[PDB]
Amino acid sequence: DGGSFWYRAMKALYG
Amino acid sequence: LTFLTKQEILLAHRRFCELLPQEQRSVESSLRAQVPFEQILSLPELKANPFKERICRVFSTSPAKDSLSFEDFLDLLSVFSDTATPDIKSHYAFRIFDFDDDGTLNREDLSRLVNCLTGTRLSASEMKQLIDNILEESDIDRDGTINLSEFQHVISRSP
Ligand SMILES: [Ca+2]
Ligand SMILES: [Ca+2]
Fold first, then answer.
1. Helical spans, DSSP H, in chain B
2. Which member of B38, B40, B91, B120 has the greatest number of CB atoms within 10 A?
3. How far is A11 from chain B (nearest CA, A)?
4. Which chain B residues are closer than 8 Å to A2 by Cβ?
5. Looking at residue B67, what DSSP letter applies?
């Protein structure tokens, strides 16, 4: 689920 | 293109100077100093980040790219701050996720990205299906790789 993956990846990086 | 508040700069200098040997803590000396990655990685604001090794390398402007100066430390903070524009944040996320630094995200970059995130590790079949799903939604030109514009576009569509 591409979009859901990128949200979690960006949150892991910037959150 | 990047912004810093006075408070961020002043607080960052205090945190950076704590990583230096006592003799290099004056303003003049601290601005010439290079802190090895080992000391940077120990910072509470970075220690829990799954991409901390890549973050250090992307922001280092040191001769052997193995340390951060105060200037590199501020560059890092300006990108990770709440003031950073979505375009700045996705531009640097692309550089961090480009594990081989060649300008495109390929299948090996995506597998390394997944392994950073999970640390329970995915089976070979689960990894294959996840990479296929990421590429289906991100690789518009169907060349098998994600370039910067494809990446910025898919990030701008975030749930
Ligand atoms: Ca690459
Ligand atoms: Ca492509």
1. 6-17, 27-30, 37-40, 52-59, 70-80, 86-97, 107-118, 124-138, 148-156
2. B40
3. 10
4. 133-134, 136-138, 154
5. E
Alpha-carbon gap, residue B136 to B106, rounded angstroms? 13
DSSP state of B63: T
Query: Of the ligands numbered here, which is closest to the C-alpha atom of B105?
Result: 1
Compare CB distances from A6 to B80, B136, B158 and report the shortest one's residue.
Answer: B158
Contact residues for B96 (Cβ-Cβ < 8 A; gap 6+): A13, B51, B54, B55, B58
List the determination method: X-ray
CA distance B152 to B68: 27
Identify whether the C-beta of residue B87 lies closer than 8 Å to the C-beta of residue B153: no
* Amino acid letter, residue B111: S
How many whole angstroms from B45 Cα to the centroid of ligand 2?
34
Beta partners for residue B36, in sequence order: B67
Q: Count the residues in chain B.
A: 159
Q: B80: buried, middle or exposed (CB in 10 Å: 19+, 13-18, 0-12)? A: middle
Q: What does the alpha-carbon distance between residue B25 and residue B34 come to, in Å, rounded to a whole number?
A: 12
B110, B132 Cβ separation under 8 angstroms: no
